[PDB]
């Protein structure tokens, strides 16, 4: 079909790399070959799913869901959502909302008690976008980085 | 005072710690509950760290190292479920376990280590700043 939503798989790597280049324009442009080993590890990782929205078969948005086993809250898992990206060039078409909301729904279907997300974006429009996906800005994020 | 990854025997001690963390949570055996603990021990990239005092787990933090394609395909990490037994707080156990988790992540070439905590909690935020964390990510959550 013309518009779809699915988990990523083998052949999706080139398209995903293009999205991640949009996400971080200063990142080096990894080739499909350079990225193959980590992509395979991701596909093999228990509880990790990369979701894509596609338009005419091209990935146009993505979000990664991480479901984590857990002993708190009646031993119910929790989840994070990471590396969400959409395109300039598809702004306001809803593909980001589709993929993030799908990831949330997938986590809740897996009995996660909460889904969390951290964003470093300065842009209030990004924050509003996450609220429109059902997130509430009621947690405080912390980060430490290294070179 | 020793830092190590959790193992099969640590379930009661971890359950006690998690009960301290969330006093409202329903109790768990052993099992239950042994099934999930088994899943966590089996989960790739996940480590439950404990600080032990003469054998007994007195503090814990969970490290999640996640494979990733951005930033030249460097991994990143989350830290979760950080707690120290009340009687042992202020002795540096919590700081030590958190710092150990950060160092483990950085040793695996993670470019960042992140965590989410409750809003407007001055003691907790000062604690994380004291471990080297910067409050420069905006946190979102949805619950069911």
For the four alpha carbons of B40, A112, A138 and A123, in that order, the dihedral sign comes to: positive
What's the rounded Cα separation, in Å, for the pair B14 and A71?
A: 9
Q: Extract the tokens encoding A146.
A: 């290294």
What's the rounded Cα separation, in Å, for the pair B4 and A129?
A: 41
The answer to whether the CB atoms of A136 and B137 lie below 8 A apart is no
The answer to whether the CB atoms of A35 and B143 lie below 8 A apart is no
Helix axes B93-107, B122-130, angle to 10 degrees: 50
**Residue reference for tokens 């002795």:** B91
User: What are the residue ranges spanned by the domains of chain B?
Assistant: 1-144
Tell me which chain A residues have a C-beta less than 8 angstroms from the C-beta of B110.
146
Tell me which chain A residues have a C-beta less than 8 angstroms from the C-beta of B15.
71
The answer to whether the CB atoms of A72 and B21 lie below 8 A apart is yes
What's the rounded Cα separation, in Å, for the pair A95 and A22?
A: 15
3-state SS assignment for residue A84:
strand
What's the rounded Cα separation, in Å, for the pair A115 and A105?
A: 10
**What is the nearest CA distance from B90 to chain A, expressed in angstroms?**
21
In this structure, which topology does domain B1-144 adopt according to CATH? Aminopeptidase (3.40.630)
How determined?
X-ray
Q: Among residues A50, A52, A13, A15, which one has the least CA distance to residue A35?
A: A13
Q: Among residues A38, A60, B45, which one has the least CA distance to residue A51?
A: A60
The answer to whether the CB atoms of A69 and B110 lie below 8 A apart is no
Q: Among residues A84, A53, A52, A78, which one has the least CA distance to residue A66?
A: A78
Instruction: Give the β-pairing of B112-118 and B76-84.
Output: parallel
Mutation for testing the B interface, residue in A67, A113, A119, A141 having most B CBs under 10 Å: A141
- What strands, in cross-sheet order, belong to the sheet with A136-145? A3-7, A48-55, A58-68, A78-85, A114-119, B134-143, A136-145, B112-118, B76-84, B56-66, B46-53, B2-5
CATH number, domain A1-147: 3.40.630.30
Using an 8 Å Cβ cutoff, are A42 and B73 in contact? no
Structure's resolution in angstroms: 1.8
């Amino acid at each position: 079909d013309a518009i779809s939503l699915r988990a990523a798989g083998p052949g999706d790597l080139p398209g995903l790399l293009e999205l991640y280049q949009v996400l971080n324009p200063s990142d080096p442009e990894l080739t499909t070959q350079e990225a193959g080993a980590v992509f395979a590890a991701m596909l093999a990782q228990p509880g990790l799913t990369i979701f894509v929205a596609t338009e005419n078969g091209k990935p146009v948005a993505t979000a990664t869901l991480l479901i984590v086993p857990n002993l708190t809250r009646a031993a119910r898992p929790y989840a994070f959502i990471e590396n969400v990206v959409t395109l300039e060039a598809r702004r306001g078409r809803g593909y980001g909302r589709t993929v993030v909301r799908h990831a949330i729904e997938t986590a809740f279907g897996a009995n996660c008690y909460k889904v969390m997300l951290l964003t470093g974006r300065h842009d209030p429009a990004v924050h509003a976008f996450y609220e429109s996906c059902g997130f509430v800005q009621n947690k405080t994020g912390f980060q430490i980085r290294q070179d």
